[PDB]
Amino acid sequence: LMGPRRPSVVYLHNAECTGCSESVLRAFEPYIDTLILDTLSLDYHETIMAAAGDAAEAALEQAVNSPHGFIAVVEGGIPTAANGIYGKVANHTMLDICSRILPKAQAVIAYGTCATFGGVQAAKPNPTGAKGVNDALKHLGVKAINIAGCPPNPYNLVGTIVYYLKNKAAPELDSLNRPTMFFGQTVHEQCPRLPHFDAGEFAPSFESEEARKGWCLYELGCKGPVTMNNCPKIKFNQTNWPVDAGHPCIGCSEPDFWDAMTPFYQN
Amino acid sequence: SSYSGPIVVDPVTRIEGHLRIEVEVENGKVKNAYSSSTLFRGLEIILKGRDPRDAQHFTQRTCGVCTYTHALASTRCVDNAVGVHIPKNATYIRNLVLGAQYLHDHIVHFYHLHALDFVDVTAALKADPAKAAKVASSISPRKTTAADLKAVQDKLKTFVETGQLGPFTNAYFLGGHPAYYLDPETNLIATAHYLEALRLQVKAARAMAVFGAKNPHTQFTVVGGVTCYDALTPQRIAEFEALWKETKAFVDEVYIPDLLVVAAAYKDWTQYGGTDNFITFGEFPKDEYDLNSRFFKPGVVFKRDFKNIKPFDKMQIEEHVRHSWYEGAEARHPWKGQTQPKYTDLHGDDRYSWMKAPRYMGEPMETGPLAQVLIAYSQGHPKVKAVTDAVLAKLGVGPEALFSTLGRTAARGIETAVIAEYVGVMLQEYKDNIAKGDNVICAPWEMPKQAEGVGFVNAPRGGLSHWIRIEDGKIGNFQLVVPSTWTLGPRCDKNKLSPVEASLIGTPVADAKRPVEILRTVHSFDPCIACGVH
Numbered sequence: 073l074m075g076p077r078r079p080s081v082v083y084l085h086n087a088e089c090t091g092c093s094e095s096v097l098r099a100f101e102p103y104i105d106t107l108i109l110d111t112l113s114l115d116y117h118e119t120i121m122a123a124a125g126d127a128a129e130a131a132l133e134q135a136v137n138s139p140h141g142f143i144a145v146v147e148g149g150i151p152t153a154a155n156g157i158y159g160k161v162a163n164h165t166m167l168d169i170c171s172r173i174l175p176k177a178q179a180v181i182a183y184g185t186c187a188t189f190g191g192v193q194a195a196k197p198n199p200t201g202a203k204g205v206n207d208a209l210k211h212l213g214v215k216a217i218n219i220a221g222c223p224p225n226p227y228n229l230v231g232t233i234v235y236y237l238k239n240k241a242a243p244e245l246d247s248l249n250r251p252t253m254f255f256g257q258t259v260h261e262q263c264p265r266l267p268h269f270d271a272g273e274f275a276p277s278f279e280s281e282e283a284r285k286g287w288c289l290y291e292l293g294c295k296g297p298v299t300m301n302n303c304p305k306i307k308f309n310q311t312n313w314p315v316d317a318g319h320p321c322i323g324c325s326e327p328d329f330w331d332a333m334t335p336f337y338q339n
Numbered sequence: 340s341s342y343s344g345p346i347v348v349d350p351v352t353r354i355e356g357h358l359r360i361e362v363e364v365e366n367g368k369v370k371n372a373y374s375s376s377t378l379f380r381g382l383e384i385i386l387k388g389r390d391p392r393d394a395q396h397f398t399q400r401t402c403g404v405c406t407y408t409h410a411l412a413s414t415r416c417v418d419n420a421v422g423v424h425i426p427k428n429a430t431y432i433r434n435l436v437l438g439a440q441y442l443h444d445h446i447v448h449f450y451h452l453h454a455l456d457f458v459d460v461t462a463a464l465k466a467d468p469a470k471a472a473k474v475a476s477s478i479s480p481r482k483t484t485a486a487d488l489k490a491v492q493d494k495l496k497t498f499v500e501t502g503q504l505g506p507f508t509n510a511y512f513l514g515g516h517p518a519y520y521l522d523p524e525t526n527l528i529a530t531a532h533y534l535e536a537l538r539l540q541v542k543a544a545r546a547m548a549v550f551g552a553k554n555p556h557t558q559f560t561v562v563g564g565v566t567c568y569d570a571l572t573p574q575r576i577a578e579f580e581a582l583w584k585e586t587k588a589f590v591d592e593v594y595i596p597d598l599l600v601v602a603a604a605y606k607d608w609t610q611y612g613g614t615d616n617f618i619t620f621g622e623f624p625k626d627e628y629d630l631n632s633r634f635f636k637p638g639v640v641f642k643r644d645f646k647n648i649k650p651f652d653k654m655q656i657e658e659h660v661r662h663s664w665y666e667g668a669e670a671r672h673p674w675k676g677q678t679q680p681k682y683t684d685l686h687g688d689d690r691y692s693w694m695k696a697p698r699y700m701g702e703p704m705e706t707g708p709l710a711q712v713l714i715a716y717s718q719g720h721p722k723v724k725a726v727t728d729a730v731l732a733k734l735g736v737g738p739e740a741l742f743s744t745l746g747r748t749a750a751r752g753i754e755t756a757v758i759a760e761y762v763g764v765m766l767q768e769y770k771d772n773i774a775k776g777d778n779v780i781c782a783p784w785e786m787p788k789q790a791e792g793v794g795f796v797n798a799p800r801g802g803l804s805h806w807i808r809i810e811d812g813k814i815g816n817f818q819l820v821v822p823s824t825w826t827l828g829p830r831c832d833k834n835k836l837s838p839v840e841a842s843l844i845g846t847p848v849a850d851a852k853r854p855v856e857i858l859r860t861v862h863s864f865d866p867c868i869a870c871g872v873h
C-alpha cells in the first residue's frame with residue numbers, strides 16, 4: 073500500500089453516515105483522482121478500497137506499522153457506551169481501534185462534526201455514548217485537528233493537509249482546535265443578506281414575498297450569527313450554499329449543534 | 340480446492356457502513372449465510388420529543404451516500420401529517436433533485452463500489468491500447484483512441500511502479516484470480532472509465548446543489564414546499580440542464596456500454612443470487628397523496644409471479660426483532676414501532692444484527708433497482724420495457740436472467756438510463772409551469788397537536804418510508820424503515836432468510852481466502868448499513 077514517496081493516509085470510519093467521505097469525493101482543483109494518484113497515498117478507506125475482510129485488515133496493519141509514518145483522517149464519532157459495543161469493525165470496538173491506531177499517527181485530522189464534537193448520534197439522549205475523537209481519547213494524548221461541518225467543505229480538508237505537508241505542522245487553530253484560516257469568521261458576517269439583517273428586514277415565512285426578495289432568514293431560525301464556517305465565501309460544489317438556496321443555516325460546524333441550535337426554525 | 344467450512348468477510352468494503360457477512364460453505368458452494376450490521380446510532384431514539392420540523396435535518400444524516408433521500412422522506416412524512424399539499428413547483432424541484440441523486444449514486448456504485456469485483460486494474464498494464472481503443476469505440480458512439488487509453492496506462496504504470504498501491508492494496512485480483520475473467524484490454528477500458536467517473540460524478544452531484552444548496556446534505560426543503568426562489572431563474576435552470584445533459588451522456592455512452600461488456604463476460608452470473616419477492620413504492624409524483632400518480636408505480640410481487648402484481652398496503656409492513664439486537668421478539672408496524680437496543684453479541688440468543696427485519700405480509704422482500712424495474716416492466720411502463728428489452732437482446736439472454744446478481748446489476752443500469760431521460764421530461768414540465776406564470780414554491784400549513792403521517796420515497800436502493808406519530812405537537816414516535824433494512828436485515832421470527840442471505844445460497848467460492856463471489860452478490864444489492872440501521 074505504501075513505502076516511500078507519497079505521504080500515507082489511513083482513513084477510519086466510526087459512527088458516521090459516509091457524508092464526510094462523499095464530501096472528499098467532491099474535491100475540486102485538485103480533484104480526488106489527483107489527490108489519490110499524485111498528492112497522497114490512500115492506504116485504507118473502507119468505502120472505496122479493493123480489499124475486504126482479512127485482506128483489508130492486513131492492509132490497515134501494513135499502513136499503520138509502516139516505518140515511513142502515516143496521517144490519520146477520522147470520520148464519525150466514537151461510541152463509548154457499554155464498553156464500545158455499539159460500533160465494531162472486524163469484531164473490534166471502534167473505541168479500541170482508534171485507541172490503538174491514532175496514537176501511532178504522525179498527525180490526526182478529525183473530519184466532520186461527528187468526529188470533531190460527537191455529532192448526530194451524540195445528540196440527546198446519546199444512547200450510544202458517542203464522543204468526538206479528542207474527547208474520547210484525551211487520556212491517550214490524541215489532539216486531532218478538527219475540521220467541522222456536517223459535512224465540512226472539502227476545501228478545508230485539502231487545505232489543511234497541504235499546509236501540514238508543506239510546513240510539517242498544524243496551521244493556527246481556534247479554541248475548538250479548528251483552523252482559523254477556514255473557521256475564523258461567522259457565516260453571518262460573510263452573508264449577502266447582512267444588509268437586510270441590519271435593516272430588520274426579515275422573511276416572516278418561506279412562502280412570503282420577503283423570502284422571495286431574499287430578505288434575512290433570522291426569524292426563520294438562521295444560525296449564521298453563532299456559526300463559524302466559510303460557506304458563503306467558498307460555497308459548495310462550486311455553486312451554492314444554504315442561505316443562497318433560501319434556507320437558514322442550522323449551525324452544523326458547531327459543537328452540540330443538534331441540541332444547541334434546535335428548534336432549527338426558531339431564534 | 341473445494342472448500343468446506345466458514346468464511347467471514349468483516350469489513351465488507353465498497354459499501355456504505357459496517358457490515359459483516361458470514362457464510363457456511365460445503366464443497367465449494369455457500370449453504371448458509373448471515374447478514375450482520377455492526378454499527379447502531381439510534382436516530383429514532385434521538386428524535387423523540389423534538390419539533391417535527393427538525394426531523395428532516397436529523398434523518399438526512401442517516402446517510403450521506405443516499406443524501407437528500409431521507410430529508411425528502413421526512414418532509415413528505417410531515418407534509419402528510421399536517422395535510423399540506425405542496426405547490427406544483429415544489430414537487431418538480433424535489434423530483435428533479437431526486438432524479439439527479441439517482442444518477443450520481445448509481446454511477447458511483449457501478450464504478451467505484453462494484454467494478455473492482457470484476458475488473459483487475461493491474462492487468463490493464465498488460466493491455467494493447469490500440470486494441471482496447473477499437474473495442475471501446477465499437478461499444479459506444481463516443482470514439483476513443485489508442486493515445487487516450489495509453490495516457491491512462493501511463494498514469495497507472497507510474498502509480499503501480501511506486502509500490503504504493505493505495506486503494507488497490509491486497510486486492511483479490513492481485514497476482515491473478517480464477518474468478519476474474521476480463522482480458523487486459525477490457526480491464527483498461529473499465530479502468531479508464533473508473534477514473535473518468537471520478538470527475539464526472541463531481542458534475543452529477545453539483546446538479547443537486549444548483550437547486551438544493553450543497554451536496555452532500557441538501558438544504559432546500561421545508562414542510563409545505565421548498566425554499567429556493569433562485570431555482571425559478573433561467574440561469575439556475577440552465578446550469579442544472581447543462582450538468583444533467585453531461586451526466587446523461589456519460590450514462591448513455593460510458594456506463595451502460597461498460598455494464599453490458601462486463602455482463603457479457605460474466606454471463607455465468609445469471610445463475611447466482613436470485614430472490615423470490617419484490618416490493619417498490621413508486622417515485623416521481625404528480626400528486627403527493629397518490630402513489631399511483633408516480634412515474635414508477637408501487638407494487639408487490641411474491642414468488643416471481645409478475646402476472647399478479649399486488650397493490651401495496653402500507654399496513655402490512657412489520658419490523659421483526661427476534662434475530663436483532665433489540666428487546667424481545669415482537670414485530671411492530673412502524674406507527675407502533677419500538678427501538679429498544681439490547682446487545683447479545685454475535686449469535687447470542689440467535690441475534691446477529693443491529694438491523695430490524697422488515698416483512699411484508701410475513702415475507703422477506705427485495706427492494707431497489709431490480710424490484711423497480713421488474714414491477715414497472717410488468718405494469719407496462721413503456722420506457723422501462725424499451726430499455727430492458729434492448730439490454731436483454733444485446734446480452735442474448737431471456738428475461739429469467741434478470742433474477743440474479745447479474746440481472747440486479749443490469750437493472751441498476753436500466754433504471755439509471757430511464758431516469759436520466761425522464762429528468763429531461765420533468766425539467767421541461769417545470770419550465771412550462773413557470774412560463775404559465777406559476778412562481779409559487781411553498782404553501783402555508785399548521786401543526787396539528789395529534790396526527791399520524793407517512794412519507795414514501797423510492798430511493799436508489801428501493802422503498803424508503805418514514806413514519807411519524809405527533810403528540811402534543813411534538814414527535815411522539817418517529818420510525819424509519821429503509822431499503823437496506825428490507826434487503827440486508829436479518830431473519831424474522833419465522834426464521835425466514837432475508838433477501839441478501841437467501842441470495843447467497845449456492846454461491847460458488849473458488850478461493851476461500853479471496854471470496855470475490857460473495858462480494859459480487861452482496862455488492863449487487865448496493866448495501867447501505869447506516870441506512871439499514873440508523
Ligand code: SF4
Nearest residue numbers: 089091184185186222
Ligand atoms: S459530520 Fe455529518 S455528514 Fe459527516 S459523518 Fe457525521 S452526520 Fe455524516
Ligand code: SF4
Nearest residue numbers: 263266288289294296
Ligand atoms: S440569512 Fe442568516 S447568515 Fe444571512 S444575514 Fe440573515 S441571520 Fe445572518
Ligand code: F3S
Nearest residue numbers: 301303321322323324
Ligand atoms: S448549516 Fe452548515 S454548511 Fe454552512 S451554512 Fe450553516 S455552517
Ligand SMILES: [Mg+2]
Nearest residue numbers: 818819820873
Ligand atoms: Mg427503523
